[PDB]
Design a protein around this ligand. Structure first.
Ligand code: 3M2
Ligand code: 3M2
Ligand code: 3M2
Ligand code: 3M2
Ligand code: 3M2
Ligand code: 3M2
Lengths: 115, 115, 115, 115
């Protein structure tokens, strides 16, 4: 139900080995750890959560962009990219959180499907 | 070797049934028809060409965005989105041409892989 | 030295009356309030800080995109757009933080100039 | 009434000295030259046309992105960025055509205002 995809707009490629941390806003309004991983050779991170565990709520996806650009010898602007959204608030959905990265810019979109 | 993917940034979904026409710049410098199709339920168009036929050159991918937005009752700015690029000019590659659409904006990127 | 500009990709217009909150990372590694305001009729927010006060550090620009869309007869995907970056690490610069908004996507860029 | 602005997502700067060519679709359905220029140090191109001359029609803005990148020690993906749109179909408007450039991606938006 939750997948993250990261692309590199400088090289025209998947962004490989990018670290991702996912949080859920708790009953008390603080950010509780939820899931993490690194992108694959296809720039994708699967297997973050299960349908059962991915209940309605506010989630934060942090994508560690800065370390990615440094490893490539390219000077970056942002510390990371943070995507904060409400999930499943009309019922269970499958989410792809995509990020397209440049050193001084990024784009993020959600593709939300109903099985 | 050539795939086109189209996303809708208003609805957060694949852009389905979007018409695509692909041209190749000919020896004479004019735009010759090459391939066409419509996006699927996943917003993807596969099977445009074969490795054999997809030789080096300048290609144009025209995505008929205007008809897409009209069918949805949303007022659009652009007539279409046109992506013009040189392909295979360091050797054969697999290309994904992605377009993320809004009524008054679009983003396009290429994901270029080497099998 | 710090300006925020916000555009609406649905309407093709400035995003007016968008609330913005700016934080700076403190010596103790928490987010200290730094500046705030709302975008004007041109989608711009000037007058956030002064050259003297805008020293080197990690800054967070929170753009309250959800309320913008909730006001217009949308229900968007994101809670807000956050832009986190290190400022003035090579000396004083002027920063424009731009954001282009759609209901299920946004893009953000920085324009960094040396006066 | 018509302005073009071009930004560089790699450097976080205006894209300076970018060539732009503007065409209008003629009664006979071919592309007639209309206006041209190069972006300034602010990445902007003003003075393309006048209110009197900029009547309703289909316009094409060609932004010569390849030469921009070829000058800088890149070899980009796209030959150019083309933006094709109907102007003034509900009456006279002022248009800013913005483009944010990366080597393998670009985004383009319109800001359309009613003076
Ligand atoms: C379905 N639904 C409606 N109509 N309004 C909601 O807030 C809602 C939430 C929801 C329901 C289930 Br069952 C589920 O597994 C997940 Br996750 C979310
Ligand atoms: C995500 N994205 C953004 N933010 N700008 C884009 O052009 C874009 C494209 C995209 C490309 C592929 Br390929 C893909 O599988 C998915 Br999902 C999205
Ligand atoms: C490989 N190569 C190099 N080094 N410079 C080129 O222009 C080039 C082009 C090319 C070669 C093959 Br065989 C092919 O199937 C495709 Br289509 C493109
Ligand atoms: C100039 N400089 C260099 N070379 N490395 C730095 O970290 C740095 C920081 C800086 C200096 C001044 Br004076 C200033 O007003 C601001 Br604001 C930032
Ligand atoms: C105003 N108007 C309406 N209502 N429908 C149109 O097609 C239209 C076009 C138009 C009118 C003027 Br007078 C003008 O200077 C420019 Br230029 C465009
Ligand atoms: C144009 N644009 C795109 N396509 N993606 C962006 O983030 C973006 C930002 C933009 C930034 C400034 Br500064 C500006 O004056 C204008 Br007019 C637009």
């Amino acid at each position: 139900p939750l997948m993250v995809k990261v692309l590199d707009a400088v090289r025209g490629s998947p962004a490989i080995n990018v670290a991702v941390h996912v949080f859920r806003k708790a009953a008390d309004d603080t950010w509780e750890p939820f899931a993490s991983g690194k992108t694959s050779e296809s720039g994708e991170l699967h297997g973050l959560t299960t349908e059962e565990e991915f209940v309605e709520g506010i989630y934060k996806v942090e994508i560690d962009t800065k370390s990615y650009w440094k490893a490539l010898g390219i000077s970056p602007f942002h510390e990371h990219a943070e995507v904060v959204f409400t999930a499943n608030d009309s019922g269970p959905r499958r989410y792809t959180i995509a990020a397209l990265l440049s050193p001084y810019s990024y784009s993020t979109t959600a593709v939300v499907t109903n099985p």
